[PDB]
Amino acid sequence: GVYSSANNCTFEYVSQPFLMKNLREFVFKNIDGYFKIYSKH
Amino acid sequence: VVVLSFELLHAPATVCGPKKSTNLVKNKCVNFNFNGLTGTGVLTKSNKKF
């Protein structure tokens, strides 16, 4: 496991898996506070 | 007693509020606002595949 300690949690999001042989291309961009994730499998 | 404190930061956030909608009318000249996009025109069924 990872993160035995964490505090001051401000955000949580859950969605179907990003990953679900496949190339798993991702682009991670961060503009004006928004974290934009693009992908192709 | 509940105190609602509104702390406006420069950080991005969802705009919170009960945004209301009207019924959709087709084949007439209307003004419109679709999720922030505004204009005037006639809305018809499209064959475009988004």
From Swiss-Prot, chain B:
Chain spans, region Disordered: 10-32
UniProt-reported outcome of changing T38K: In strain: Omicron/BA.1
Organism superkingdom: Viruses
Subunit structure: Binds to host ACE2. RBD also interacts with the N-linked glycan on 'Asn-90' of ACE2. Cleavage of S generates a polybasic C-terminal sequence on S1 that binds to host Neuropilin-1 (NRP1) and Neuropilin-2 (NRP2) receptors. Interacts with host integrin alpha-5/beta-1 (ITGA5:ITGB1) and with ACE2 in complex with integrin alpha-5/beta-1 (ITGA5:ITGB1). May interact via cytoplasmic c-terminus with M protein. May interact (via N-terminus) with host bilirubin and biliverdin, thereby preventing antibody binding to the SARS-CoV-2 spike NTD via an allosteric mechanism.
Task of the protein: Attaches the virion to the cell membrane by interacting with host receptor, initiating the infection. The major receptor is host ACE2. When S2/S2' has been cleaved, binding to the receptor triggers direct fusion at the cell membrane. When S2/S2' has not been cleaved, binding to the receptor results in internalization of the virus by endocytosis using host TFRC and GRM2 and leading to fusion of the virion membrane with the host endosomal membrane. Alternatively, may use NRP1/NRP2 and integrin as entry receptors.
Protein name: Spike protein S1
Range of the intact protein held here: 510 to 559 of 1273
